[PDB]
Design an enzyme around this catalytic site. Structure first.
Site, PDB file in Angstrom:
ATOM      1  N   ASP A 139       3.182  -4.655  -5.928  1.00 17.53           N
ATOM      2  CA  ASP A 139       3.591  -5.978  -5.476  1.00 17.53           C
ATOM      3  C   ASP A 139       5.075  -6.198  -5.745  1.00 17.53           C
ATOM      4  O   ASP A 139       5.821  -6.623  -4.860  1.00 17.53           O
ATOM      5  CB  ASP A 139       2.769  -7.063  -6.172  1.00 17.53           C
ATOM      6  N   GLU A 146       0.834  -1.194   0.000  1.00 17.17           N
ATOM      7  CA  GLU A 146       0.000   0.000   0.000  1.00 17.17           C
ATOM      8  C   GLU A 146       0.875   1.253   0.000  1.00 17.17           C
ATOM      9  O   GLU A 146       0.438   2.326  -0.414  1.00 17.17           O
ATOM     10  CB  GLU A 146      -0.940  -0.005   1.209  1.00 17.17           C
TER      11      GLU A 146
HETATM   12 ZN   LIG Z   1      -2.959  -2.091  -4.032  1.00 14.15          ZN
END
Ligand SMILES: [Zn+2]
Length: 422
Positions: free
Chosen positions: A371, A283
């Site tokens: 990611d 995030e």
């Molecule tokens: Zn995300």
């Protein structure tokens, strides 16, 4: 560029067309969920029992989706071919007494309209909460709280929606020739205030914000922050258990300034231990690569296209005339901007499908990059287990249809998030 074109037919044809397309998507997805029994890369890490239960959750989601679409297409086409808008305008103004009656009856029309869209939606919203997700033990709310939430949402909608819309509408009056850049800037500034005001003022009324119990996890998150940057005002754990046992995490900050990290009650509980931090690396990935910047920019292009086209169709409507012209209980005087905007909204639906593809794709690749970025920080192995546990407890769909996911899924398939790392 001119007034007389068959609008009724076109709008009905568009709504039916894109409902049918969306029905095709949902159809394919239903097919796969019911037929297939195996994930390729998740054949070891998904219990055969919790796989079936997830097949059922997705099945009921699709069923309800199609019924919800038919419902919302049915009331629209009926609203259209029977000219139901003029009638609501009259009934709205009729319920205005105290004189404190004004030129912007538009707000009245929208007042009763939105309240009708609520009550007509109510049955569906009730089914989804107290049936679809009570059947899967996800919903933890009583009817008392649900209704209270609805009333708080409408009351807020009028409280701040009214004033903002009013200014939005009167901006058209001051600039009848060149309104574009003015309403453009208007929406921009309202956007900035929006992301700053909703979390600070509006959210506290919905959920109880408490600061993260000082200890281990607080230190971990604090360490990841200090390592990768200085973006951290404080951490709060919201009580999202009151709604349902769903989990999520996000940060609210007026960029670029201090940023607060909100974590869901069901998250800190025993599903994510400190794989929570791998998630927060993901995030923080969104922030590091300036995705929010890319999104506001890609958003402004959209808005510009919309209101560029608006200049063309804010002149004359098939509907009531506004300054006897050939039909009944019609409405008169100044053309009202709100109405032309709505019908225009339903004129664009194909354009929206195109930009639904575009926006969904951009979001997908943003998740890809975040990611990979979490891998860069070494949170790879924890992040994998995090996503897997989320899919397990949320019964997310296992193997999805490529097209359906291409249209709807803003986040890549779990399998697709793993293959990019694992
Ligand atoms: Zn995300």
């Amino acid at each position: 560029d001119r007034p007389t074109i068959p609008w009724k037919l076109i709008i009905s044809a568009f709504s039916i067309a894109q409902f049918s397309f969306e029905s095709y998507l949902t159809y394919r997805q239903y097919q796969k969920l019911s037929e297939t029994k195996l994930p390729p890369v998740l054949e070891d890490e998904i219990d055969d029992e919790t796989f079936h239960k997830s097949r059922n959750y997705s099945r009921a989601k699709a069923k309800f989706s199609i019924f919800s679409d038919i419902y919302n297409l049915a009331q629209k086409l009926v609203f259209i071919k029977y000219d139901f808008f003029p009638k609501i305008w009259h009934m709205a103004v009729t319920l205005s007494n105290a004189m404190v009656s004004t030129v912007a009856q538009s707000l009245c029309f929208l007042g009763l309209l939105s309240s009708m869209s609520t009550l007509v939606d109510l049955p569906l919203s009730y089914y989804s909460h107290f049936v679809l997700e009570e059947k899967f033990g996800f919903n933890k709310l009583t009817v008392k709280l649900w209704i209270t939430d609805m009333i708080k949402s409408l009351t807020l909608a009028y409280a701040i929606g009214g004033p903002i819309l009013y200014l939005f509408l009167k901006i058209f009056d001051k600039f009848p020739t060149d309104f574009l850049w003015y309403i453009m800037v208007f929406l921009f500034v309202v956007q900035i205030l929006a992301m700053t005001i909703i979390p600070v003022f509006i959210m506290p009324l919905f959920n109880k914000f408490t600061p993260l119990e000082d200890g281990e996890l607080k230190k971990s998150i604090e360490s990841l922050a200090d390592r990768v940057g200085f973006p951290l005002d404080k951490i709060f754990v919201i009580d999202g258990s009151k709604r349902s046992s769903h989990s999520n995490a996000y940060f609210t900050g007026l960029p670029f300034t201090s940023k607060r990290i909100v974590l869901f009650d069901t998250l800190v509980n025993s599903n994510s231990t400190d794989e929570i931090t791998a998630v927060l690396a993901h995030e923080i990935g969104h922030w590091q690569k300036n995705h929010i910047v890319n999104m506001v920019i890609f958003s402004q292009l959209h808005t510009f296209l919309i209101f560029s086209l608006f200049t063309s169709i804010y002149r004359n409507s098939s509907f009531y005339n506004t300054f006897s012209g050939f039909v009944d209980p019609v409405i008169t005087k100044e053309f009202p901007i709100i109405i032309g905007f709505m019908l225009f909204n339903d004129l664009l639906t194909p354009l929206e499908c195109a930009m639904q593809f575009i926006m969904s794709l951009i979001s997908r690749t943003h998740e890809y990059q975040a990611d990979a970025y979490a891998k860069k920080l070494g949170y790879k192995q924890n992040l994998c287990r995090a996503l897997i546990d989320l899919q397990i407890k949320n019964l997310s769909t296992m193997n999805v249809d490529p097209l359906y996911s291409s249209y709807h899924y803003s986040h890549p398939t779990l399998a697709e998030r793993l293959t990019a790392l694992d």
